[PDB]
């Protein structure tokens, strides 16, 4: 099973209209979270949404990475600016409290696209701007649509992007203290 | 006597700024502005999801003398296929939900005109403009089946309050198609969108009930609640006052369509038997039955206001305005097609005289050809269109093709000549789907 | 032996997206892409006001391997004449001031392309295409007066920095107009915008100063402050360091042109006399004398960066680019105008043949006159264009006067044939004012 | 801030007035007509001698 740590009531509305009840889960986030490592572990316990995802996954702070109600944790954001640098450093900093989640690689990313053209009956799926550059030499009927946001896809694209995701991994270099001190 | 200059100003704040809709288009005053802004952007790319800021900041020159925040959230609230039955205006974004009836933002959300709107709102461009000069939308748009019956409208003005209820698409189609024939008017049936409970009358008034299912001795699956209950206001208004007595408890197991609320009883409750007082305690405690009231008050084709007790006379008045406003289109198409018939006949006759070349054509310098064609009895009236002639049509194949077009125009002119209101309106009523 | 494939990829970061402009156009690559988006939002109507986000959000398929914010605030910073002299882009709104060098919004201000750009950027389309496919802007736009000397570039790159200061437009006009003539090149004078102070040479380096104006025994009115600080960094770096010692105080009375700050003397200070040591204490304390550095480090038409001690060689390399880059247009227009007069003789002779009408056209099928147009030596290269002939040709007014515009393009044909590059570039230099 | 700038202290008459006239302009669609004009009028109606 998996848990989607997606954003807002919109994406969980589409997720309720899309997901499998047995396999795929979900949870939104209430709002803006601050810098992750400026706050004590009892103050991550004072924070509300972090305690919510400590209780839903069953991995509360101060314990070994076991008895997890969700074997997978996925986070599903908007690919313009809404979660590309806002949800992810704070969420990866909070998930850095258990390095055994990262050793098993239990946090993934589902890439919503950037550009979609509607060609024929089946629209195309440029995931990034680099694939949009590299495959503009052979792509017909260039009617452009921007996917700057989770709302910019309908229920059908949300359906084939949950039921057929890509599950991009999270970052893990040889040191897990040198790269998270960049933002401060 | 100038304080009435304040008060009549109040009468342009309590007449033309009213929330009362119209019987004909089924539209609010702000809905014509957001529709006109969306179609002003539709043009060729009627499929490019235009930004809700561009709609919302675009209604300034349409004549809406209020805030852009009102249309900015109005377009969010009326682009929902789950709040309303008939899809009028589509889009990509959040437009509300039965979990939470809000949008996620208004700045990552883009809206679109629907092709079903143009399947259902012909004679939009024929619509007469409002008495006020600044109103760039017309006075009322023109549907095939009305938007008063479909999807519902609710509001409260000064002294009058509309609560018009959504109805099912096939029954509104059958109602307009059957009251067009002048028979006993079928009142349309009501189908709330994504509602698997039961909608029935009690006494002149509708009730809505969802679905509750006994699953054990002390367990419940409310598969559906009635329509005006979301998750958390129903939890905090009813289910949490039931929780604080220690009576029941809830599980969050909401389904694919509708709800999935599983409720487990506790032992400090009634838990009565015999299947008439336990169900009484259920729809008095869980609230499985919800009642309402009806008052069909709606502004007519002018600025006055009229009240109906039923939608039968509403459908009758809609189709009796629709009869004349299709008849106007019939007369306009007849007067277009007769002059277009005489013109196409003139051009086919002149392409016969071109591919013959029986007109002297060379050496007619200083336009002596059209000084010869200014005295022909019909060629004169459109000399400026008989002269746009290349050499490319001298071969006879295009002459015979324009003669075939002329014969095709004749039967066409006979088809739109002999026709009337009823068959074209019922062909539109057939081809809305 | 693969790690260099990252490092040359690092060279991919440090060749095409540097902050150093090229020496012909004077354009940064980000400025090339925002110019291309400004004309892309101009297209037909140049005068139409483009939206800053619509400028900035559309650069992504224009060649920029970065985000929209760098072009977004680049367009904000070079839109204003309080910082620069030559307006590359006009706009509706404010983009800064000399008092406050901050723009209004990244999402409110309008933009359009100025007419003087077209008065100085002709022949920006005959440049050869780039190696990279994304660079639909040319590698250098071709001016009559370059932007390296027009306006200023204050940029830091990988080991290279530019602080190329603005110059006065009549002096660069004389400099390019006289370096066209091939004598000793006049050095352009430096005139910062809205400046009535003194920029003077001391030894190889231009120092700047404003004007400070004594008005009484214990008061001044500061006319100008130097161009390193606008208001609050100026106060935090200068006026509050001398104000917090108790020496002197100031008051904000900033006028229209320049600054207007009124300075009141307190009692503990030097208060010196003789107008040598008091002025030296002012330029030591108020910071009127400011020193800069100059180095013309600019990439040429190839990938090598050229370092110039003085802009005379910059103007010489600019004009040695421009002479051949307009002799390309000379050869292109010569090859255009020879076949243009050949088609002119085709149309004039064929229309005198048509108004003669010795060729018979009536009853002639299958474009049979093309069977007598194909065996002409001269009409046969233009057959489709010469059967594209409407009736208005047949009037002899537009036969004979169209023949006399064939003679008018004959005299223009000999006008482009007799002219050479230096006198049309003299027309370019003389008709900018 | 504006009562310190104008010199009309709260609870006293309009005396030691730093500015003789007070003028308001805003974006006159809805930004200042029905939003900040009634709030500023509710501020300035507490001194009816200003009216």
Tab-separated table of N, CA and C in Angstrom, chain B residues 258-329:
chain	number	residue	atom	x	y	z
B	258	UNK	N	-20.261	9.360	-3.820
B	258	UNK	CA	-21.041	9.517	-2.614
B	258	UNK	C	-20.173	9.445	-1.371
B	259	UNK	N	-20.781	8.981	-0.286
B	259	UNK	CA	-20.096	8.859	0.990
B	259	UNK	C	-19.934	7.386	1.364
B	260	UNK	N	-19.261	7.146	2.485
B	260	UNK	CA	-19.093	5.795	2.982
B	260	UNK	C	-19.101	5.660	4.492
B	261	UNK	N	-19.867	6.503	5.191
B	261	UNK	CA	-19.658	6.741	6.622
B	261	UNK	C	-20.121	5.553	7.455
B	262	UNK	N	-19.185	4.874	8.108
B	262	UNK	CA	-19.501	3.719	8.938
B	262	UNK	C	-19.577	4.153	10.398
B	263	UNK	N	-20.724	3.901	11.022
B	263	UNK	CA	-21.040	4.397	12.358
B	263	UNK	C	-21.311	3.202	13.264
B	264	UNK	N	-20.564	3.101	14.358
B	264	UNK	CA	-20.738	2.017	15.317
B	264	UNK	C	-21.415	2.554	16.572
B	265	UNK	N	-22.504	1.903	16.979
B	265	UNK	CA	-23.227	2.280	18.183
B	265	UNK	C	-22.438	1.881	19.431
B	266	UNK	N	-22.751	2.538	20.543
B	266	UNK	CA	-22.251	2.140	21.852
B	266	UNK	C	-23.413	1.636	22.704
B	267	UNK	N	-23.072	1.053	23.854
B	267	UNK	CA	-24.051	0.341	24.667
B	267	UNK	C	-24.908	1.264	25.523
B	268	UNK	N	-24.555	2.541	25.634
B	268	UNK	CA	-25.355	3.508	26.387
B	268	UNK	C	-26.340	4.243	25.477
B	269	UNK	N	-27.086	3.471	24.695
B	269	UNK	CA	-27.976	3.976	23.663
B	269	UNK	C	-29.306	3.238	23.783
B	270	UNK	N	-30.241	3.554	22.885
B	270	UNK	CA	-31.505	2.830	22.827
B	270	UNK	C	-31.293	1.400	22.342
B	271	UNK	N	-30.781	1.254	21.110
B	271	UNK	CA	-30.599	-0.021	20.394
B	271	UNK	C	-31.894	-0.831	20.349
B	272	UNK	N	-32.985	-0.141	20.029
B	272	UNK	CA	-34.307	-0.745	20.034
B	272	UNK	C	-34.460	-1.720	18.871
B	273	UNK	N	-35.379	-2.659	19.039
B	273	UNK	CA	-35.664	-3.706	18.073
B	273	UNK	C	-36.860	-3.318	17.197
B	274	UNK	N	-37.424	-4.308	16.499
B	274	UNK	CA	-38.704	-4.413	15.770
B	274	UNK	C	-38.823	-3.531	14.523
B	275	UNK	N	-37.753	-2.837	14.111
B	275	UNK	CA	-37.578	-2.255	12.770
B	275	UNK	C	-38.574	-1.140	12.449
B	276	UNK	N	-39.153	-0.514	13.472
B	276	UNK	CA	-39.910	0.716	13.276
B	276	UNK	C	-39.524	1.833	14.231
B	277	UNK	N	-39.016	1.520	15.421
B	277	UNK	CA	-38.512	2.543	16.326
B	277	UNK	C	-37.005	2.713	16.241
B	278	UNK	N	-36.270	1.675	15.821
B	278	UNK	CA	-34.849	1.864	15.558
B	278	UNK	C	-34.639	2.739	14.329
B	279	UNK	N	-35.480	2.581	13.299
B	279	UNK	CA	-35.377	3.417	12.106
B	279	UNK	C	-35.885	4.829	12.384
B	280	UNK	N	-36.871	4.949	13.286
B	280	UNK	CA	-37.305	6.249	13.789
B	280	UNK	C	-36.178	6.967	14.516
B	281	UNK	N	-35.454	6.240	15.370
B	281	UNK	CA	-34.290	6.790	16.056
B	281	UNK	C	-33.148	7.075	15.087
B	282	UNK	N	-33.085	6.344	13.970
B	282	UNK	CA	-32.052	6.593	12.968
B	282	UNK	C	-32.322	7.902	12.233
B	283	UNK	N	-33.515	8.067	11.643
B	283	UNK	CA	-33.649	9.292	10.857
B	283	UNK	C	-34.103	10.473	11.704
B	284	UNK	N	-34.294	10.284	13.013
B	284	UNK	CA	-34.359	11.429	13.907
B	284	UNK	C	-32.999	11.733	14.532
B	285	UNK	N	-32.110	10.740	14.616
B	285	UNK	CA	-30.793	10.940	15.216
B	285	UNK	C	-29.706	11.153	14.164
B	286	UNK	N	-29.538	10.196	13.244
B	286	UNK	CA	-28.572	10.370	12.164
B	286	UNK	C	-29.041	11.381	11.127
B	287	UNK	N	-30.345	11.645	11.053
B	287	UNK	CA	-30.883	12.624	10.131
B	287	UNK	C	-30.887	12.143	8.697
B	288	UNK	N	-31.468	10.964	8.463
B	288	UNK	CA	-31.466	10.400	7.121
B	288	UNK	C	-32.487	11.059	6.204
B	289	UNK	N	-33.448	11.802	6.743
B	289	UNK	CA	-34.518	12.423	5.967
B	289	UNK	C	-34.336	13.932	6.047
B	290	UNK	N	-34.364	14.621	4.901
B	290	UNK	CA	-34.346	16.079	4.935
B	290	UNK	C	-35.447	16.624	4.031
B	291	UNK	N	-36.196	17.599	4.551
B	291	UNK	CA	-37.334	18.242	3.906
B	291	UNK	C	-36.921	19.628	3.402
B	292	UNK	N	-37.843	20.315	2.726
B	292	UNK	CA	-37.551	21.629	2.144
B	292	UNK	C	-38.852	22.411	1.965
B	293	UNK	N	-38.784	23.477	1.164
B	293	UNK	CA	-39.952	24.247	0.759
B	293	UNK	C	-39.692	24.818	-0.629
B	294	UNK	N	-40.772	25.154	-1.333
B	294	UNK	CA	-40.690	25.637	-2.705
B	294	UNK	C	-41.360	26.998	-2.841
B	295	UNK	N	-40.705	27.897	-3.585
B	295	UNK	CA	-41.261	29.213	-3.907
B	295	UNK	C	-40.596	29.675	-5.203
B	296	UNK	N	-41.328	29.584	-6.312
B	296	UNK	CA	-40.775	29.864	-7.641
B	296	UNK	C	-41.037	31.340	-7.935
B	297	UNK	N	-40.142	32.208	-7.479
B	297	UNK	CA	-40.219	33.629	-7.797
B	297	UNK	C	-39.060	34.003	-8.713
B	298	UNK	N	-39.375	34.662	-9.827
B	298	UNK	CA	-38.400	34.865	-10.894
B	298	UNK	C	-38.845	36.065	-11.729
B	299	UNK	N	-37.884	36.917	-12.076
B	299	UNK	CA	-38.130	38.082	-12.917
B	299	UNK	C	-38.414	37.618	-14.343
B	300	UNK	N	-39.448	38.190	-14.969
B	300	UNK	CA	-39.814	37.834	-16.339
B	300	UNK	C	-38.948	38.548	-17.376
B	301	UNK	N	-39.410	38.585	-18.633
B	301	UNK	CA	-38.644	39.166	-19.735
B	301	UNK	C	-38.378	40.666	-19.582
B	302	UNK	N	-39.219	41.401	-18.856
B	302	UNK	CA	-38.922	42.781	-18.499
B	302	UNK	C	-38.449	42.833	-17.044
B	303	UNK	N	-38.316	44.044	-16.497
B	303	UNK	CA	-37.782	44.218	-15.155
B	303	UNK	C	-38.707	43.837	-14.014
B	304	UNK	N	-39.952	43.471	-14.308
B	304	UNK	CA	-40.905	43.067	-13.288
B	304	UNK	C	-40.612	41.642	-12.819
B	305	UNK	N	-41.318	41.227	-11.771
B	305	UNK	CA	-41.089	39.954	-11.103
B	305	UNK	C	-42.400	39.183	-11.026
B	306	UNK	N	-42.349	37.863	-11.248
B	306	UNK	CA	-43.543	37.032	-11.233
B	306	UNK	C	-43.306	35.774	-10.404
B	307	UNK	N	-44.376	35.293	-9.768
B	307	UNK	CA	-44.317	34.130	-8.888
B	307	UNK	C	-45.205	33.030	-9.455
B	308	UNK	N	-44.646	31.826	-9.547
B	308	UNK	CA	-45.332	30.613	-9.958
B	308	UNK	C	-45.394	29.657	-8.774
B	309	UNK	N	-46.411	28.798	-8.769
B	309	UNK	CA	-46.466	27.717	-7.792
B	309	UNK	C	-45.874	26.421	-8.327
B	310	UNK	N	-45.564	26.365	-9.621
B	310	UNK	CA	-45.044	25.164	-10.255
B	310	UNK	C	-44.227	25.557	-11.478
B	311	UNK	N	-43.424	24.603	-11.963
B	311	UNK	CA	-42.600	24.828	-13.146
B	311	UNK	C	-43.322	24.480	-14.440
B	312	UNK	N	-44.601	24.093	-14.368
B	312	UNK	CA	-45.388	23.805	-15.567
B	312	UNK	C	-45.625	25.082	-16.369
B	313	UNK	N	-46.063	26.149	-15.692
B	313	UNK	CA	-46.225	27.437	-16.351
B	313	UNK	C	-44.887	28.079	-16.687
B	314	UNK	N	-43.826	27.730	-15.955
B	314	UNK	CA	-42.481	28.197	-16.285
B	314	UNK	C	-41.997	27.600	-17.605
B	315	UNK	N	-42.204	26.291	-17.789
B	315	UNK	CA	-41.863	25.616	-19.041
B	315	UNK	C	-42.746	26.122	-20.182
B	316	UNK	N	-44.034	26.364	-19.894
B	316	UNK	CA	-44.965	26.899	-20.889
B	316	UNK	C	-44.589	28.311	-21.336
B	317	UNK	N	-44.218	29.183	-20.394
B	317	UNK	CA	-43.805	30.539	-20.735
B	317	UNK	C	-42.457	30.565	-21.440
B	318	UNK	N	-41.546	29.661	-21.047
B	318	UNK	CA	-40.269	29.506	-21.735
B	318	UNK	C	-40.463	29.089	-23.188
B	319	UNK	N	-41.322	28.097	-23.434
B	319	UNK	CA	-41.525	27.643	-24.804
B	319	UNK	C	-42.397	28.614	-25.603
B	320	UNK	N	-43.237	29.425	-24.943
B	320	UNK	CA	-44.023	30.414	-25.670
B	320	UNK	C	-43.231	31.678	-25.983
B	321	UNK	N	-42.128	31.930	-25.271
B	321	UNK	CA	-41.192	32.958	-25.718
B	321	UNK	C	-40.265	32.392	-26.796
B	322	UNK	N	-39.868	31.119	-26.633
B	322	UNK	CA	-39.015	30.416	-27.586
B	322	UNK	C	-39.646	30.268	-28.962
B	323	UNK	N	-40.978	30.145	-29.028
B	323	UNK	CA	-41.678	30.032	-30.307
B	323	UNK	C	-41.504	31.292	-31.157
B	324	UNK	N	-41.698	32.467	-30.549
B	324	UNK	CA	-41.507	33.724	-31.267
B	324	UNK	C	-40.036	33.997	-31.563
B	325	UNK	N	-39.129	33.603	-30.663
B	325	UNK	CA	-37.727	33.894	-30.940
B	325	UNK	C	-37.058	32.856	-31.839
B	326	UNK	N	-37.741	31.765	-32.180
B	326	UNK	CA	-37.323	30.955	-33.321
B	326	UNK	C	-37.998	31.453	-34.606
B	327	UNK	N	-39.224	31.997	-34.497
B	327	UNK	CA	-39.955	32.554	-35.640
B	327	UNK	C	-39.222	33.760	-36.233
B	328	UNK	N	-38.620	34.588	-35.367
B	328	UNK	CA	-37.787	35.701	-35.825
B	328	UNK	C	-36.573	35.208	-36.610
B	329	UNK	N	-35.954	34.118	-36.142
B	329	UNK	CA	-34.844	33.485	-36.851
B	329	UNK	C	-35.286	32.895	-38.188
